[PDB]
Amino acid sequence: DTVEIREVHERNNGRDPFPLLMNRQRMPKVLVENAKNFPKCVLEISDQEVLEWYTAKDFIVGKPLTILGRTFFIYDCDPFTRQFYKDKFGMPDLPPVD
Amino acid sequence: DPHKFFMSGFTGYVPRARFLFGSSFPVLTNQALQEFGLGLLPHYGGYVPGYKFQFGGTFGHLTHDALG
Amino acid sequence: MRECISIHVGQAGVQIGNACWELYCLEHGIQPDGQMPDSFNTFFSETGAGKHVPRAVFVDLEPTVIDEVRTGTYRQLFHPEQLITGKEDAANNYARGHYTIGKEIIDLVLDRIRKLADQCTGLQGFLVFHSFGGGTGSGFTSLLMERLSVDYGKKSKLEFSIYPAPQVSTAVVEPYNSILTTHTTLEHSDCAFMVDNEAIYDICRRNLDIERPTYTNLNRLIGQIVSSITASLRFDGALNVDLTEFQTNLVPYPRIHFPLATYAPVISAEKAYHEQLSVAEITNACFEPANQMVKCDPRHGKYMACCLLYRGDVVPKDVNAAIATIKTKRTIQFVDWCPTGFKVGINYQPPTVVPGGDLAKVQRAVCMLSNTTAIAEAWARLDHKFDLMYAKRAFVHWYVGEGMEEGEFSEAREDMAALEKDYEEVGVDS
Amino acid sequence: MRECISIHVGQAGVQIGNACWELYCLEHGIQPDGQMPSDKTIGGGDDSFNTFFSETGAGKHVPRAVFVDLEPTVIDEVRTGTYRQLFHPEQLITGKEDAANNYARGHYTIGKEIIDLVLDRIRKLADQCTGLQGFLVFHSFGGGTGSGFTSLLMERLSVDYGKKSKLEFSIYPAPQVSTAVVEPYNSILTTHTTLEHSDCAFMVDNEAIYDICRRNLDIERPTYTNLNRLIGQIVSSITASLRFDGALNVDLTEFQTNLVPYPRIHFPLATYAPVISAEKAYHEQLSVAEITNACFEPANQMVKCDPRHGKYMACCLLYRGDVVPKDVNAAIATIKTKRTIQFVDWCPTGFKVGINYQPPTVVPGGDLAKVQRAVCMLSNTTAIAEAWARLDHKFDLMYAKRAFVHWYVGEGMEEGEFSEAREDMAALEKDYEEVGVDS
Amino acid sequence: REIVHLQAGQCGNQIGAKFWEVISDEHGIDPTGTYHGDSDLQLERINVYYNEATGGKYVPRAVLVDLEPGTMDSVRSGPFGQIFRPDNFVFGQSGAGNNWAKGHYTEGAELVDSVLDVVRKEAESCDCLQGFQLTHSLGGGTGSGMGTLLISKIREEYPDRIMNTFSVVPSPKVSDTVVEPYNATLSVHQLVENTDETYCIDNEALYDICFRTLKLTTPTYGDLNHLVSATMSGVTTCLRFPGQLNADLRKLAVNMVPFPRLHFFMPGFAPLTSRGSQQYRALTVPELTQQMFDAKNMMAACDPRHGRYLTVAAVFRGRMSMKEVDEQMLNVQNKNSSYFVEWIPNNVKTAVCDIPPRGLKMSATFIGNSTAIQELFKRISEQFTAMFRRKAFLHWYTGEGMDEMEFTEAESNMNDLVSEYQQYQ
């Protein structure tokens, strides 16, 4: 149940070629109210500070997804993901958004 | 919204201080925090388009159309 | 009847005259579009329709600084032919102004001046708002101060000018150009308002707390230093003086004719509430070296004359005691042939700060005018630069090109050798 | 017309003055912003706030104080605090790097930069005054800013003005309680000034105020807010013969010629007699004969020494409130009949008195109690020679193998003064001895 | 204050194609030739680089000449090429190669009588002309032929103007042409006779700017045409827009040239940063001043460390303060005063404008003179030794009687240009 975010580099985009925006890690969706004072500089976020983790249900084509204060708009998914959502969640075809 | 300035001589950080220039310190600081939160003149030394479609009228009456 | 026509020449004279003639329309009740909703005929004329029109001349040989005025800001104020323009700028040398491009309108400055000379019942002097370091302000000025003394002559001479700073420099070879007017002033000058830029980026940085200033932060203060000189004709007072009266004192010899300027009470819009603003303090704030309007220290030299002009709420008995404090101090010194060495004039009106300005609404004002012999040490370093260039003979190549032979160069040294010699002779014990 | 300048150098003096100018403004009707309230008033004739405050023609008041330090973080609290409209914003003088308790960083390299600037405010304030009678400098002995930069400041005033009084107020190092490690170096190095330039350099220590905070006031674990507010009351009591008219007033130079016997014995102490809380206040009498012998307790002295180990060369009792002059003569003889109190053989009079008319004032949110009669008591004694004895024992064990030294020599400080200042300090502890004896 | 801008060679049809976009960018003109700009301060004095026509249409004062029509087919094919004068493309038929001696002499003489006509037709259509611009090729035969011809050909009609080339110049790394070393030797020799303001441009530094201060991985010509397209209109910023310290190229040339023998220049352009890291820089006056004096921002591929400057000029374009300029020009004159000389008591002149360009707010332009440009003319002098004594590629150059004594006096006077280093250091 880990998330990794990769940057897509175009030719002549003027950016340093770094393949990753975010390392593969488990992503907290909702933190406990007391976790505002959690010493993130010394401790990793444990299951005790997280009220809700990101699940496969939270990634939906055509919806905004907020990770680490950045709002991503999911516009398409691969054929395997499309089949997996149909089989696991009974969701109708996830049309690509232009 | 008064008393919204730092005293002159303040050494600590004030945001957007290095981008608004030409004045003393509190009159920079108040705007820094507010940011952080008819006819042309004759004998003219210049350009006016509409230069060529003219005959027989004075300069102001010629350039009144060019300004409006 | 107490009329005065003063002239503006150069890049500066429009820009300084933007903020000099800002104030003389503001001191009186005059709207900028020619109207008023007595003693207003010192800096104005009158039309029977009611419109008020001024009188001064503006010269710059490219049009845009005069097209700054000719566009929407100050259209209805000035006379449409006291704004005369060339078509190409004289551009950092004396040659294009004095000789080649000036001739097609030097007989356009003189059909206006003489037509404005003969519409004044009185007159007192000619005063110049020009710039030493230019090619127009030392080209077209010395096409006019040498030329009026052929015609008018014995009338008074003063020069509100802009001097080369010691450390800060704007152009490159201009030290050589500066000596193309000290040839001509010393034979036809009776006053000189020498002003640098480095000293008013620091007066504006100590008294005001404005670090890093601009010209409109600066040029509105030169517009003040003139107006405490022309206050006495313009408004009444307890002891009114005239433009021929201060020159009777301030020039002692045929070779010590170089006063200075100092605007004494200068402060921000904030520190004046916590300031007492007393007469006994803004008379001995003038003398300290950090209040001089040029980078000069008055310790190692001397003082020759001291002219004072007051404004607003001034009683004379504390001024008569403020002077007697000073002359018993001995951190400043005096020459032994001048035991009197003082002058005080007083008016009734208080100063006027411009709206949207950077100074305080004060009911007092002091101008300190001082002949100083320590200006010789200031004239040491500027003309010391001449020796480091004339040995290698830089730029004499284009200098000789448009009509200035080397005769100008030889004379200039032999003027400054005798000018630096007499200042040694004036300070010695007799 | 009876004026005084009040300089504040370093953190241990500036934080005193933040509670001093509360205390001065509360005595009069002046708010923080300087405007008189024009609605309510404590009554009083004009020209009474003069001796500490100037007065613009607008109506604001300006203190006669300059706040100078080499680090910015203690003054920048004041520029944004609640007393920002109080001061003139060019009085507040600030540097870049602090002394780091190095005498050589406040007298030799870093301190030289500001000392051309800070004398142009002592020059600028003084000629705005008509007749002036001295200074009020607030430094501390243990630091490179309080004991280094004061010597740079105070040498310049003796060559400029000379005979005019300087009234220092300096925290003195304690026996057990201490914070720095190089404090025995600092306090024995600034004693060239009190040798030569000073006139009256009074002493506090932070250790003895802790006990008088603990027993007299109902305070456990006192802050430094409570320290500072008790100190300025001593300062506000010696300067009430200026701002008020009293029954038997004492001038600021006529006490100097009775409280300083010889030109080397100018180091007296302080004491404040009624210091109590609001729930033991109305359960006692407070009489003149009660708060006079409450001054001479061992437990009420401002500096933790033994008053019984020596002689009282001269004392100056300052009284304020409803005190009639028959009561003071009753209580001075009651003291002089006692024998555990101690005399001087060649000083027959011994005591100088001063009575005023304006009571002590109370700061809201403060810890003091509202009384009607208060006494500050300044006494010369030889009890402080043994406090010099313990500090010089804390200094020579450093210097016996040149410990901690090389941080001093790295900023132009020589080794030659460390030897000289010890022997010059050594010449002080005999001069208490050779006059404290009998015939 | 009119300006004549001569464009010959392919480069002058390729630089000046990208020149005449920027000076139609700033005056708000579409390539149909109509005014569709933002404010009315740019139509006021539209005349400096541009001209009026009937019906409201706008048509420049352009001259673009070459011999082969293999260049002017590319100007009219572009986006902004339709505004140009249809009578300036005076095209021959037989193009030149790499030796210029058949360019101006044989193939040019039938065409230069049409080049000299429209230029004299331009001069009678101007009111107060000031100078003579040029952008061409010093190692490209048609530009060093038929432009350096014209340097000697309108000076006869008008000696009272200022000549200011925008010159390319040969370089160490490669030969794009084997002819250009000894081809340049006599055309540069004609300049020293006559030049006043020589703006030498290279292609190492304009491929080193593109890889370390723009981080840009495949630089075509259209990158390098535009960066020099900025520094042309960056030096005449005052004649068409108002300001607070105006300047012309007489105001430039009074300060800059001290002796009649050393007067060769080198340009720059200040506010340069990469596309990715635009939000990390602090674009103000103290950083643009530090950027414009180093070695990595010079468009002439020479280091200014081993040669002292004598005269330095700049300009800015936008609302700013002036104590922040006059102290910072006084910083670099005395922070490192071993890189100027002690007999010129000033080295810096600056000027200001009012209106910043489209897409920036604070723009600047660097112009420099120094004594390290003798090392740029050292290498062409060095290559001549290995080529002359073997009489190497000579038969194209003695091809119509132009003698070997036209060759011997070139380096006999190009030693003298570096023999004017003795009066300096």
PDB file of all heavy atoms in Angstrom, chain D residues 151-183, unseen atoms left out:
ATOM      1  N   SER D 151      34.276  50.539  30.698  1.00  0.00           N
ATOM      2  CA  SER D 151      35.589  51.171  30.824  1.00  0.00           C
ATOM      3  C   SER D 151      35.939  52.000  29.604  1.00  0.00           C
ATOM      4  O   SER D 151      36.602  53.032  29.723  1.00  0.00           O
ATOM      5  N   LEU D 152      35.511  51.562  28.425  1.00  0.00           N
ATOM      6  CA  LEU D 152      35.674  52.382  27.237  1.00  0.00           C
ATOM      7  C   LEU D 152      34.791  53.613  27.299  1.00  0.00           C
ATOM      8  O   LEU D 152      35.180  54.684  26.832  1.00  0.00           O
ATOM      9  N   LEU D 153      33.604  53.482  27.876  1.00  0.00           N
ATOM     10  CA  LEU D 153      32.678  54.603  27.912  1.00  0.00           C
ATOM     11  C   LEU D 153      33.049  55.610  28.984  1.00  0.00           C
ATOM     12  O   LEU D 153      32.876  56.815  28.783  1.00  0.00           O
ATOM     13  N   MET D 154      33.571  55.139  30.108  1.00  0.00           N
ATOM     14  CA  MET D 154      33.721  55.947  31.307  1.00  0.00           C
ATOM     15  C   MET D 154      35.046  56.693  31.349  1.00  0.00           C
ATOM     16  O   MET D 154      35.142  57.743  31.993  1.00  0.00           O
ATOM     17  N   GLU D 155      36.061  56.183  30.653  1.00  0.00           N
ATOM     18  CA  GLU D 155      37.292  56.933  30.459  1.00  0.00           C
ATOM     19  C   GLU D 155      37.057  58.184  29.639  1.00  0.00           C
ATOM     20  O   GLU D 155      37.712  59.206  29.858  1.00  0.00           O
ATOM     21  N   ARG D 156      36.139  58.120  28.681  1.00  0.00           N
ATOM     22  CA  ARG D 156      35.871  59.262  27.823  1.00  0.00           C
ATOM     23  C   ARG D 156      35.102  60.357  28.552  1.00  0.00           C
ATOM     24  O   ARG D 156      35.269  61.540  28.236  1.00  0.00           O
ATOM     25  N   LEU D 157      34.264  59.995  29.520  1.00  0.00           N
ATOM     26  CA  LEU D 157      33.517  60.999  30.266  1.00  0.00           C
ATOM     27  C   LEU D 157      34.378  61.715  31.298  1.00  0.00           C
ATOM     28  O   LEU D 157      34.124  62.886  31.599  1.00  0.00           O
ATOM     29  N   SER D 158      35.382  61.039  31.860  1.00  0.00           N
ATOM     30  CA  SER D 158      36.263  61.705  32.815  1.00  0.00           C
ATOM     31  C   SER D 158      37.171  62.719  32.137  1.00  0.00           C
ATOM     32  O   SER D 158      37.505  63.744  32.737  1.00  0.00           O
ATOM     33  N   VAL D 159      37.582  62.460  30.897  1.00  0.00           N
ATOM     34  CA  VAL D 159      38.420  63.431  30.207  1.00  0.00           C
ATOM     35  C   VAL D 159      37.561  64.533  29.596  1.00  0.00           C
ATOM     36  O   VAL D 159      38.057  65.643  29.361  1.00  0.00           O
ATOM     37  N   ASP D 160      36.267  64.290  29.400  1.00  0.00           N
ATOM     38  CA  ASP D 160      35.411  65.332  28.849  1.00  0.00           C
ATOM     39  C   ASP D 160      34.831  66.227  29.941  1.00  0.00           C
ATOM     40  O   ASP D 160      34.905  67.455  29.839  1.00  0.00           O
ATOM     41  N   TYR D 161      34.250  65.637  30.981  1.00  0.00           N
ATOM     42  CA  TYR D 161      33.540  66.392  32.007  1.00  0.00           C
ATOM     43  C   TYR D 161      34.259  66.428  33.343  1.00  0.00           C
ATOM     44  O   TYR D 161      34.309  67.480  33.980  1.00  0.00           O
ATOM     45  N   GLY D 162      34.790  65.306  33.806  1.00  0.00           N
ATOM     46  CA  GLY D 162      35.653  65.359  34.962  1.00  0.00           C
ATOM     47  C   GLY D 162      34.950  65.289  36.298  1.00  0.00           C
ATOM     48  O   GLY D 162      34.630  64.205  36.789  1.00  0.00           O
ATOM     49  N   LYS D 163      34.718  66.456  36.899  1.00  0.00           N
ATOM     50  CA  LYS D 163      34.285  66.543  38.287  1.00  0.00           C
ATOM     51  C   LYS D 163      32.825  66.169  38.510  1.00  0.00           C
ATOM     52  O   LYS D 163      32.420  66.001  39.665  1.00  0.00           O
ATOM     53  N   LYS D 164      32.031  66.030  37.454  1.00  0.00           N
ATOM     54  CA  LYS D 164      30.626  65.693  37.618  1.00  0.00           C
ATOM     55  C   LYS D 164      30.446  64.225  37.983  1.00  0.00           C
ATOM     56  O   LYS D 164      31.183  63.346  37.532  1.00  0.00           O
ATOM     57  N   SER D 165      29.431  63.979  38.802  1.00  0.00           N
ATOM     58  CA  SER D 165      29.238  62.699  39.465  1.00  0.00           C
ATOM     59  C   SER D 165      28.823  61.602  38.496  1.00  0.00           C
ATOM     60  O   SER D 165      28.134  61.848  37.508  1.00  0.00           O
ATOM     61  N   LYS D 166      29.268  60.383  38.771  1.00  0.00           N
ATOM     62  CA  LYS D 166      28.848  59.207  38.024  1.00  0.00           C
ATOM     63  C   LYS D 166      28.315  58.200  39.027  1.00  0.00           C
ATOM     64  O   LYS D 166      29.014  57.843  39.977  1.00  0.00           O
ATOM     65  N   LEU D 167      27.079  57.756  38.826  1.00  0.00           N
ATOM     66  CA  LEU D 167      26.378  56.926  39.804  1.00  0.00           C
ATOM     67  C   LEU D 167      26.095  55.573  39.170  1.00  0.00           C
ATOM     68  O   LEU D 167      24.992  55.307  38.692  1.00  0.00           O
ATOM     69  N   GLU D 168      27.096  54.703  39.206  1.00  0.00           N
ATOM     70  CA  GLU D 168      26.974  53.371  38.648  1.00  0.00           C
ATOM     71  C   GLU D 168      26.127  52.500  39.548  1.00  0.00           C
ATOM     72  O   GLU D 168      25.958  52.764  40.741  1.00  0.00           O
ATOM     73  N   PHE D 169      25.592  51.441  38.959  1.00  0.00           N
ATOM     74  CA  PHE D 169      24.779  50.480  39.693  1.00  0.00           C
ATOM     75  C   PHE D 169      25.067  49.125  39.067  1.00  0.00           C
ATOM     76  O   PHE D 169      24.622  48.845  37.953  1.00  0.00           O
ATOM     77  N   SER D 170      25.823  48.303  39.773  1.00  0.00           N
ATOM     78  CA  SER D 170      26.433  47.142  39.162  1.00  0.00           C
ATOM     79  C   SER D 170      26.176  45.906  39.993  1.00  0.00           C
ATOM     80  O   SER D 170      26.433  45.901  41.200  1.00  0.00           O
ATOM     81  N   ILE D 171      25.680  44.859  39.335  1.00  0.00           N
ATOM     82  CA  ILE D 171      25.514  43.562  39.974  1.00  0.00           C
ATOM     83  C   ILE D 171      26.884  42.960  40.245  1.00  0.00           C
ATOM     84  O   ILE D 171      27.760  42.949  39.371  1.00  0.00           O
ATOM     85  N   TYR D 172      27.084  42.476  41.459  1.00  0.00           N
ATOM     86  CA  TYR D 172      28.371  41.976  41.870  1.00  0.00           C
ATOM     87  C   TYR D 172      28.341  40.453  41.927  1.00  0.00           C
ATOM     88  O   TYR D 172      27.291  39.874  42.208  1.00  0.00           O
ATOM     89  N   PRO D 173      29.449  39.776  41.616  1.00  0.00           N
ATOM     90  CA  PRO D 173      29.453  38.306  41.644  1.00  0.00           C
ATOM     91  C   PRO D 173      29.289  37.716  43.042  1.00  0.00           C
ATOM     92  O   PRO D 173      29.902  38.166  44.010  1.00  0.00           O
ATOM     93  N   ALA D 174      28.466  36.673  43.116  1.00  0.00           N
ATOM     94  CA  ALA D 174      28.035  36.022  44.344  1.00  0.00           C
ATOM     95  C   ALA D 174      28.994  34.896  44.742  1.00  0.00           C
ATOM     96  O   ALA D 174      29.815  34.464  43.931  1.00  0.00           O
ATOM     97  N   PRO D 175      28.953  34.434  46.018  1.00  0.00           N
ATOM     98  CA  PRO D 175      29.785  33.287  46.408  1.00  0.00           C
ATOM     99  C   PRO D 175      29.522  31.984  45.669  1.00  0.00           C
ATOM    100  O   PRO D 175      30.406  31.483  44.969  1.00  0.00           O
ATOM    101  N   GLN D 176      28.319  31.434  45.790  1.00  0.00           N
ATOM    102  CA  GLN D 176      28.010  30.139  45.196  1.00  0.00           C
ATOM    103  C   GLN D 176      27.272  30.259  43.877  1.00  0.00           C
ATOM    104  O   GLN D 176      27.635  29.591  42.905  1.00  0.00           O
ATOM    105  N   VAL D 177      26.246  31.102  43.838  1.00  0.00           N
ATOM    106  CA  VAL D 177      25.463  31.322  42.631  1.00  0.00           C
ATOM    107  C   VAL D 177      26.311  32.051  41.597  1.00  0.00           C
ATOM    108  O   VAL D 177      26.804  33.159  41.838  1.00  0.00           O
ATOM    109  N   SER D 178      26.512  31.411  40.448  1.00  0.00           N
ATOM    110  CA  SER D 178      27.165  32.035  39.307  1.00  0.00           C
ATOM    111  C   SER D 178      26.703  31.321  38.050  1.00  0.00           C
ATOM    112  O   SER D 178      26.198  30.199  38.103  1.00  0.00           O
ATOM    113  N   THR D 179      26.865  31.997  36.921  1.00  0.00           N
ATOM    114  CA  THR D 179      26.467  31.450  35.633  1.00  0.00           C
ATOM    115  C   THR D 179      27.622  31.322  34.652  1.00  0.00           C
ATOM    116  O   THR D 179      27.809  30.253  34.076  1.00  0.00           O
ATOM    117  N   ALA D 180      28.426  32.363  34.467  1.00  0.00           N
ATOM    118  CA  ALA D 180      29.555  32.268  33.554  1.00  0.00           C
ATOM    119  C   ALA D 180      30.709  31.505  34.202  1.00  0.00           C
ATOM    120  O   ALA D 180      30.680  31.158  35.382  1.00  0.00           O
ATOM    121  N   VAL D 181      31.741  31.233  33.412  1.00  0.00           N
ATOM    122  CA  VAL D 181      32.943  30.588  33.912  1.00  0.00           C
ATOM    123  C   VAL D 181      34.113  31.577  33.995  1.00  0.00           C
ATOM    124  O   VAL D 181      34.972  31.434  34.883  1.00  0.00           O
ATOM    125  N   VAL D 182      34.100  32.639  33.200  1.00  0.00           N
ATOM    126  CA  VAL D 182      35.176  33.609  33.173  1.00  0.00           C
ATOM    127  C   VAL D 182      34.836  34.855  33.988  1.00  0.00           C
ATOM    128  O   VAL D 182      35.464  35.896  33.804  1.00  0.00           O
ATOM    129  N   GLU D 183      33.823  34.778  34.850  1.00  0.00           N
ATOM    130  CA  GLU D 183      33.457  35.921  35.686  1.00  0.00           C
ATOM    131  C   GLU D 183      34.549  36.405  36.641  1.00  0.00           C
ATOM    132  O   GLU D 183      34.615  37.628  36.855  1.00  0.00           O
TER     133      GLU D 183
END
